[PDB]
Ligand binder design. Sequence first.
Ligand code: NA
Ligand code: NA
Lengths: 392, 392
Amino acid sequence: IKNAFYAQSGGVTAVINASACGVIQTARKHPDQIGKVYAGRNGIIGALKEELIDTSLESDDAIQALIHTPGGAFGSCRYKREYERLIEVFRAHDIGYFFYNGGGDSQDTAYKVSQLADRMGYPITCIGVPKTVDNDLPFTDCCPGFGSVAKYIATSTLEASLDIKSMCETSTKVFILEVMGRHAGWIAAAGGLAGQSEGEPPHVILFPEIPFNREKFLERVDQCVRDYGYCVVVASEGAQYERFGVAPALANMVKQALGHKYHWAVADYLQRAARHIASATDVEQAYAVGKAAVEMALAGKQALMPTIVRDQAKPYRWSIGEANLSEVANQEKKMPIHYITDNGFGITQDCRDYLQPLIAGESFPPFDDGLPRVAKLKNQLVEKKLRTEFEL
Amino acid sequence: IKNAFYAQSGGVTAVINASACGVIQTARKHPDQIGKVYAGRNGIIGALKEELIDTSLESDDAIQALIHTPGGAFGSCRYKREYERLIEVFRAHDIGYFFYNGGGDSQDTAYKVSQLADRMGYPITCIGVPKTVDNDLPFTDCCPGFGSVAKYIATSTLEASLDIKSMCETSTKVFILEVMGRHAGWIAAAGGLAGQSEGEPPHVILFPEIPFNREKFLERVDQCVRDYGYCVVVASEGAQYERFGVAPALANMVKQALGHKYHWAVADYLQRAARHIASATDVEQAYAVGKAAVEMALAGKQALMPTIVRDQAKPYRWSIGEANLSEVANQEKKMPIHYITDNGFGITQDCRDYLQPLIAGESFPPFDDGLPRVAKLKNQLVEKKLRTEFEL
Ligand code: NA
Ligand code: NA
């Protein structure tokens, strides 16, 4: 029970590989407690199909590269007997450590593995590493990955705004930028960090937490174009009533109803892969939770998820705390309404106090020939052992 | 005839303000030849309506900020008697220098002003400063602004690709990224800089120069998803036959015809406003053409547009040259087909040799509280003089 198994889960992030780096590098700093670090090819599917990547065959440099490369270096999946097969392949490979890096579902399943492992007489210390661009995990200040998209959305909103503002007298006067966020508006909220007073961008932020009042929307925008000269709205894909992609939908609304020239963009995967403008504090934290999960497992702790704790709002200070996987599931983290302005289309000062520090600092990745440098892993498989196995 | 008039024209750029900086700073370095530098509020419309911005009231710092702030700091317009009114307001304000910073149309009109100025007995040296995200101006290696979008598109394609690649076995296997470029494919071509061999992203680049062969497209993508696991296409809004926004259109094509899970994004204004990942050589050149236009005017030269000349492909070397405005119009610059692969969906080595150096180096702007710092100008108007004036 000396090797460790690391796997990613759910949608990838611009810094989820930073976590992988934090976990892998510290594991290598304890050869007397942990042997090889195996990575699940394409997530737990990898463990299930017994496709284990031997990350020990990877040079220190490559591993170091992980902190400035987006996506999932080993691959991920959204996949949610199976538990029995996980322990069968873990013990066959001397795996006593299970580091599961993902959203809520992941944390829960990590816990269950822990339960079955004991039951079957095969303890395996399982520590989950937080990961969510939606920032909806509980018992943590922020979720690794969000800080970076927040910075991206805020920057993108600020830049597009300066553009529109430049020619709103002649050309387009309404710009809509559709961002991620189906049930949570944390991402859309980051857009408000672009402007700090009233009259400056973004004029409208569509939160999925606030039902869409077409009449209130159409009149706020119209009011903006003829007061400030233009209007930029940051709408999350989760715009709903009690849906609507969204960008073009609203654009059509303003056109047929206000006649203003519009423009829209849809960042999609761009926002969660923009490692070029990642948040330093975010990649810093992505690394830390990975290191702390390997440390908690060394200290002999069990079934925990590392956390980020805000030890100080003023001059923002943070550190890593702990949380019981057992309770991570069936809790979540909803965006507190007192974060949204009464207009329903704005962020409040309490929300700025929370976000602003999260996007602090820049962690530009190194650049080679004009482009960002990326990992480049061997990702070689270990020699099978079991006798095959199908999934659902 | 000692003050100068600067104006922007057409769509703004991430570095068009860098040009404005290059022109303004050098003008201030010759108080014995040039007086105050006036800026046209919202382009020549400003001169027409006699709304002149006194940029002399701006601090050196603010002016310096111009090189790291996107959009048009003084505003721009797409506007194309009027010539007579331009000279009437120029001479009323002692303007002997006219620095017009825009695309082809701008250059031509700059020239005509020069012609009328003489005819009317009011010489005004007019030097045009190149500006085009479409990179279709003639007599110049590259057009200021393009290098930056190119870098943005290439980076964005590389980042989104790493994402898709991470989960193409379980989730989405076809990603489409719609970029700017209606009649030219220079922007779309920049996407190819993300991958250098065959099999790596972008697998398909839709150029407006190549007619869209649906069957050839659908089979190239399908061939890619089941050969490399996924397929990313960078399509310019100018995808046509002999149109189709485009992103969702093609997405629908692959869905109904290949059944693959897709994803798309539409960068829109984001690509031309992304000063955060601008190209150093690009902002370097944007400044230089601005400085060189003020220099050519000091040397007493007339009716010229500064240019960028590639004095060396190998270890890329460039400098500023000159071009007769008189001929800039009614020429243009088409993308040479031997730059596009025979597949019709790729960039060729000759195209890489041309582009790669253009996106070289990073010019990250300074950052304040998590976001990029921006100009902040007074942009005060000079006291009217004429007796009003309407436009068309
Ligand atoms: Na997820
Ligand atoms: Na133009």
